[PDB]
Design a protein around this ligand. Structure first.
Ligand SMILES: [Co+2]
Length: 239
C-alpha cells in the first residue's frame, strides 16, 4: 500500500487509540484486537535491531537494557533486551494492561495472579503449620499472599503477542532461554513510581501441574537486577 507509515508508527498510533461520534469509531475490544494484529506482524528488522548472540556478567554490566520508543499518559512503548542467561524477575503491573512481542531469541514467560476476592476468589492467610525453605520471618508470614501459577511457556518471534490485564496474568517473569532475547513491550497506563503505580517484585515460596496454587511474597528489586538504557535504532515515532 502507498503512503503507509512505518509499522512502529502505526503500532504507536493504534496503542494511542486503544488506551488514550459519526460514524462510530472502534471501542476497546476491537481496538485491542487491532493492536494485537499489528504486533503479530512486527519483526526485529522493522525496528532495525539485529539479533544478538552470546559472560559471566559482572556487577558492572546490566543484565537487561531498555530501548525507549514512545510514551504518553496512556501507554508506554519500548524494547527490553535480555542478555544470555538473564531474566526479568517476577513482577506485577498494578491496574495495567500489557502486551508484548518477541523480536528474537526465546523467552520463558511465567504468568501468575494474586488471588483476588473481586474475582470470586477467597484468599486465605498462610496457615500457621505451613513452613518454607528458607523459613519465613514472622513479619513475612503475615505479608504472604495466595496466588496461582497459570502458565510457564516459551515464546519466540513466531509466537503470538503475550497479553496481560489488570486482573489476569498480571504477574510475570521473563527468562532468556538459550541465549540473548528481546521483546517489544506495551504497557497501559505506564508505571508511575512517583504516583503510586510501582513495579512490584515477588518470589514464589517453597513449602505438580498447572494451574496450581502458590504463595507469593513481595520482595525488593533484586540487588543484581537493573536495566539501563541504550540507543533505539528503529524508525522514530512522530512527533
Ligand atoms: Co512486565
Amino acid at each position: 500500500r502507498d503512503n503507509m507509515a512505518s509499522l512502529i508508527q502505526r503500532i504507536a498510533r493504534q496503542a494511542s487509540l486503544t488506551f488514550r461520534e459519526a460514524p462510530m469509531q472502534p471501542g476497546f475490544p476491537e481496538n485491542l484486537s487491532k493492536l494485537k494484529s499489528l504486533l503479530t506482524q512486527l519483526r526485529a528488522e522493522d525496528l532495525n535491531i539485529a539479533p544478538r548472540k552470546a559472560q559471566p556478567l559482572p556487577p558492572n554490566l546490566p543484565p537487561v537494557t531498555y530501548m525507549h520508543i514512545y510514551e504518553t499518559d496512556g501507554f508506554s512503548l519500548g524494547v527490553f533486551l535480555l542478555k544470555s542467561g538473564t531474566s526479568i524477575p517476577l513482577h506485577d503491573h498494578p491496574g495495567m494492561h500489557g502486551m508484548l512481542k518477541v523480536l528474537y531469541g526465546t523467552v520463558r514467560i511465567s504468568c501468575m495472579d494474586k488471588l483476588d476476592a473481586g474475582g470470586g476468589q477467597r484468599p486465605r492467610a498462610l496457615p500457621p503449620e505451613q513452613q518454607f525453605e528458607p523459613p519465613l520471618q514472622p513479619r513475612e508470614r503475615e505479608a504472604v499472599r495466595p496466588g496461582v501459577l497459570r502458565s510457564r511457556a516459551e515464546y519466540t518471534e513466531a509466537s503470538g503477542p503475550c497479553i496481560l490485564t489488570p486482573h489476569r496474568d498480571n504477574l510475570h517473569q521473563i527468562d532468556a532461554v538459550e541465549g540473548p532475547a528481546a521483546f517489544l513491550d506495551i504497557l497501559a497506563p505506564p508505571y508511575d513510581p512517583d504516583d503510586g503505580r510501582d513495579c512490584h517484585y515477588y518470589r514464589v515460596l517453597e513449602p505438580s501441574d498447572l494451574p496450581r496454587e502458590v504463595w507469593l511474597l513481595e520482595t525488593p528489586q533484586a540487588d543484581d537486577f537493573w536495566c539501563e538504557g541504550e540507543p533505539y535504532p528503529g524508525p522514530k515515532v512522530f512527533p
